């Protein structure tokens, strides 16, 4: 018998043909020049995730003095062979010590799971050793290598079991252990980060007790005990959602729950806080809670801190917040990438993070609902008006209030195309009073909408009046704004594509054989194969049909009937 | 590029030590980072140059006296210097390249007496 699987040529036969013209006999090695270097140069300068020709792949295995000239050019050489046989990885990992020291930024093309490499593994380590703050944003990432982390690991359990058959019970892990002893910080960072995936890999769980066997200081302990109470605390939350009571009710329970529980804080010590790792916790204001109408029974608490001042915060469970936990880390990451530009969106960070499996926590924001928005204040003018209104003496003009509204509309338009986010409607997109647009629901996203696929931009006919009244100025402004975020971001977009490559490659929700195509969508909306900017202004003339339709069919004024009946 | 914090204002004798730091906020992983003194009415020069690689170069008339380390823990910058002069006393400032873009945070003025 035999096997036909995966009319027609194959890769298999590719790679024989290809591997038997890969001679490369007569061992002396030329140091030759020409004008050829640039273009070979331009040929190494492609996208990291790009899989590379046959001729492309040997001219840059010719190329391996300006190849390790160019510190930009590792990466690409190294993906431009295969380690097999010890022969080419006796030269290969020879040069990986000799060649110049990579940009970290290019070093996350190199850290995903493509490459098992050992020594790949180890010098990136090495490179890595150095840990910044933007490693404790970094953590999310982490946290897909830590889930990737596990090759062949039957020798490394059998190598502790070793050493555990003596007692009764009762590689750059040791880098990330050394980091996570370092900082307090860091290492709450890490457990917060383990009490997640401790639910998808049960090695984990005792990956969190090895954490704590990796951190000898016993201090970020005893808060990190304090914290775990939080726990039980959700245990108390989801007590106080086992029970089916009237709205009023519930809410007076949840005002008696909220007492319980303020007992219990001023009872404990102050732990960490939830929105950032230095400032700590004093108590909570029972009165000043809230609770959500929806149907995950959210729970919102106003927490007084340490620095004598209110926090709103607002918390779930039963769900799996993971995936607007990864959006909002991404929009933060994205926020520090604009920054980097020297230029500010005015977008709000909102912090999420999940606690528990099925429990998760984040920042309340005053925001109000957009169809509140619109039944209750008659259009989005009187809100904004409402907290600080300006009427000019001249055009009636308004501030940075408008101004930073409208940076913020224009930025999550370049968010929701780039990132193509999807199940965002009325409901959950919010407004936010501090002059933010904001955005909720992750949960579906690259290029996943509840309805049929709608086009890239999340603008609305509302925003498209507001901002089309003021088209004369605001549309440029915004199409400016536009146009430098898409240089900014498609600048500085490697290190993202590589990461979210890594973080892909370990796992996702509402995502799962999405992962390549989901690759090669985010490149295609970044449009990497094009060098001319033109699309953008493809998207803007767009962006000016969602006023009124183009009609050039009637299936096409169908169409645009039909995004308007969707909105 | 990024923005970031330095702070080296002050006034001291000859011969005495001042240390300057610079801690920045932004995306990490910077090209390079280093720190330059100008005075009214002139032009700035080039002083201390810390790399990526973790390779430092200083002028001429600053060796052995200002030196650059680069804490990599939080990110920060600190440049230690020794022996001031009079003709040393104006106003510094620390620059970081980041990706081909050039950043500078802040300045600072420095007296000797």
């Known amino acids: 018998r035999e096997i036909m699987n995966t009319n027609d040529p194959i890769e298999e036969k590719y790679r024989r043909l290809e591997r038997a013209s890969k001679n490369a006999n007569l061992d002396k090695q030329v140091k030759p020049d020409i004008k050829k270097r640039d273009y070979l140069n331009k040929i190494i300068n492609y996208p990291p995730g790009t899989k590379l020709t046959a001729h492309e792949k040997g001219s840059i295995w010719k190329y391996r003095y300006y190849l390790m000239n160019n510190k930009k050019a590792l990466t690409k050489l190294l993906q431009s062979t295969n380690l097999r046989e010890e022969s080419e990885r006796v030269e290969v990992l020879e040069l990986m010590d000799s060649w110049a020291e990579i940009d970290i930024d290019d070093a996350l093309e190199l850290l995903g799971s493509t490459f098992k490499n050992l020594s790949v593994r180890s010098y990136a380590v090495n490179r890595l050793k150095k840990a910044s703050d933007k490693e404790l944003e970094l953590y999310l990432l982490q946290l897909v290598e830590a889930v990737c982390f596990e090759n062949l690991s039957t020798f490394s359990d059998k190598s502790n079991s070793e050493f555990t058959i003596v007692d009764a019970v009762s590689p750059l892990a040791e880098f990330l252990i050394r980091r996570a002893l370092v900082n307090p910080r860091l290492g709450s960072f890490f457990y917060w980060y383990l009490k997640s995936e401790s639910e998808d890999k049960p090695y984990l769980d005792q990956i969190l007790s090895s954490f704590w066997s990796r951190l000898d200081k016993k201090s970020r302990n005893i808060l990190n005990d304090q914290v775990r109470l939080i726990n039980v605390l959700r245990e108390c939350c989801e007590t106080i959602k086992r029970l089916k009571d009237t709205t009023a009710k519930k809410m007076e329970l949840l005002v008696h729950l909220l007492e319980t529980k303020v007992r219990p804080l001023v009872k404990v010590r102050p732990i960490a806080l939830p929105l950032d790792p230095d400032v700590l916790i004093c108590d909570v204001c029972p009165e000043t809670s809230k609770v959500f109408k929806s149907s995950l029974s959210p729970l919102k608490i106003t927490f007084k801190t340490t620095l004598n001042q209110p926090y709103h915060l607002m918390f779930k469970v039963g769900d799996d917040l993971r995936q607007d936990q990864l959006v909002v880390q991404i929009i933060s990451l994205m926020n520090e990438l604009l920054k980097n530009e020297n230029v500010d969106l005015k977008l709000t960070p909102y912090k999420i993070l999940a606690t528990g499996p099925q429990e998760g926590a984040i920042e309340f924001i005053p925001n109000d609902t957009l169809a509140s928005i619109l039944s209750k204040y008659h259009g989005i003018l009187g809100y904004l008006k409402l907290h600080y209104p300006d009427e000019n003496a001249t055009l009636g003009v308004q501030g940075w209030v408008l101004d930073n509204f409208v940076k913020s509309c224009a930025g999550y338009c370049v968010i929701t195309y780039i990132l193509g986010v999807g199940d965002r409607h009325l409901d959950n997109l919010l407004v936010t009073p501090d002059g933010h647009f904001f955005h909720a629901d992750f949960g579906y996203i690259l290029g996943q909408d509840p309805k049929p696929f709608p086009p890239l931009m999340k603008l609305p006919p509302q925003i498209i009046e507001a901002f089309g009244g003021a088209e004369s100025s605001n549309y440029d402004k915004f199409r400016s704004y536009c146009f430098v975020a898409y240089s900014i971001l498609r600048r500085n977009a490697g290190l993202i594509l590589n990461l979210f490559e890594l973080m892909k490659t370990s796992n996702i929700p509402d995502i799962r054989i999405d992962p390549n195509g989901a690759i090669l969508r985010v490149r295609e909306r970044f449009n990497l194969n094009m060098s001319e900017e033109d699309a953008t202004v493809h998207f803007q003339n767009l962006i000016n049909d969602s006023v009124n339709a183009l009609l050039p069919i009637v299936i096409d004024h169908l169409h645009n009937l039909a995004q308007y009946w969707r909105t | 590029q990024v923005q970031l914090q330095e702070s080296g204002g002050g006034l001291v004798q000859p011969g005495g030590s001042l240390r300057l730091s610079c801690a920045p906020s932004?995306?990490?992983?910077?090209?390079?980072m280093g720190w330059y003194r100008q005075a009214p009415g002139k032009q700035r020069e080039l002083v201390a140059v810390?790399?990526?690689?973790?390779?430092?170069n200083y002028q001429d008339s600053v060796k052995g006296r200002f030196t650059i380390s680069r804490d990599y823990v939080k990110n920060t910058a600190y440049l230690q210097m020794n022996n001031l002069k009079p003709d040393d006393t104006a106003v510094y400032i620390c620059?970081?390249?980041?990706?081909?873009?050039?950043?500078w945070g802040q300045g600072t003025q420095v007296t000797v007496s």
């Open positions: 932004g995306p990490f992983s910077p090209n390079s």
């Open positions: 620059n970081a390249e980041t990706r081909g873009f050039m950043h």
């Open positions: 810390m790399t990526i690689d973790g390779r430092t």
